[PDB]
Design a protein around this nucleic acid. Structure first.
Ligand SMILES: [Zn+2]
Ligand SMILES: [Zn+2]
Length: 63
RNA sequence: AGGAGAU
């Protein structure tokens, strides 16, 4: 698992909330309604909001 | 860090 810093945001700076493409958004996607995945390990099991990795990769101290 | 395009 790897990536870069990001936050709960909208529009530019993020991608289609359904597939992960940039030329469109989740409401203009061209595939069926996918499960959204952890922005950190892509595990649908949980969310980055609970990623078992970030707990020791970037647990931060502010939110 | 959790949805819908500024949070
Ligand atoms: Zn898409
Ligand atoms: Zn995760």
């Amino acid at each position: 698992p790897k990536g870069k810093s990001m936050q709960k945001r909208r529009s530019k700076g993020d991608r289609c909330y359904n597939c992960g493409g940039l030329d469109h958004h989740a409401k203009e996607c061209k595939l069926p309604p996918q499960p959204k995945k952890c922005h950190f390990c892509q595990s649908i099991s949980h969310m980055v909001a609970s990623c078992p990795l970030k707990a020791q990769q970037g647990p931060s101290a502010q939110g």
